[PDB]
Amino acid sequence: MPNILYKIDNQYPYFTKNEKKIAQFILNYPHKVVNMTSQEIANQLETSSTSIIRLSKKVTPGGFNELKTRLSKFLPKEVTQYNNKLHSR
Amino acid sequence: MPNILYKIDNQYPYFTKNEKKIAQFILNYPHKVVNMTSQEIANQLETSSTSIIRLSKKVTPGGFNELKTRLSKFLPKEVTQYNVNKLHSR
Numbered sequence: 001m002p003n004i005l006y007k008i009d010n011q012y013p014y015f016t017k018n019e020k021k022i023a024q025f026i027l028n029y030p031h032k033v034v035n036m037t038s039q040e041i042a043n044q045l046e047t048s049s050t051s052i053i054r055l056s057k058k059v060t061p062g063g064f065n066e067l068k069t070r071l072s073k074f075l076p077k078e079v080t081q082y083n084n085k086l087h088s089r
Numbered sequence: 090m091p092n093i094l095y096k097i098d099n100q101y102p103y104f105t106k107n108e109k110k111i112a113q114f115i116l117n118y119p120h121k122v123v124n125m126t127s128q129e130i131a132n133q134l135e136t137s138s139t140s141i142i143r144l145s146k147k148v149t150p151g152g153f154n155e156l157k158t159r160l161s162k163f164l165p166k167e168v169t170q171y172n173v174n175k176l177h178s179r
């Protein structure tokens with residue numbers, strides 16, 4: 001079974017300085033990322049939205065939407081009824 | 090300021106299967122947790138009280154009781170006097 005965080009962690013050392021900044025953010029704040037727009041991430045990291053998109057496409061074919069989808073699989077499931085579902089994105 | 094739920098949410102993906110079970114319960118039922126013992130949580134989750142204590146110490150140095158103290162800061166405050174608030178109990 002694939003694991004996007006495993007991939008990013010192990011590819012990380014060969015990324016550019018800017019790619020590393022974005023990747024480290026993803027690895028360190030994977031929960032926060034899934035409910036952020038690319039523009040929001042860019043402002044937080046003092047980079048461009050485009051850069052967030054390009055690194056997303058580098059690590060997964062479907063880019064930013066797919067990165068968030070994939071991340072969400074490794075986040076906590078949410079309670080459906082308080083007497084479970086995939087984490088939101 | 091620090092936020093223990095923020096920490097657990099963002100560390101969660103790298104935890105072991107058992108740690109994730111415990112952490113998901115804390116994240117999903119944080120109010121329920123503050124008035125449970127580690128043995129009660131263990132029985133709910135079909136795991137060991139020691140594993141609850143270990144996960145607690147992993148996320149906060151004071152362990153299980155400190156976990157509950159920190160959680161209580163993010164729970165509703167309770168009414169001190171009913172006249173026609175205080176830190177949530179632990």
Ligand SMILES: [Cl-]
Binds near residue numbers: 009
């Ligand atoms: Cl690894």
Ligand SMILES: [Cl-]
Binds near residue numbers: 031032
């Ligand atoms: Cl978060």
Ligand code: NA
Binds near residue numbers: 024025
């Ligand atoms: Na970071």
Ligand code: NI
Binds near residue numbers: 031087098
């Ligand atoms: Ni969440």
Ligand code: NI
Binds near residue numbers: 120177
């Ligand atoms: Ni209460």
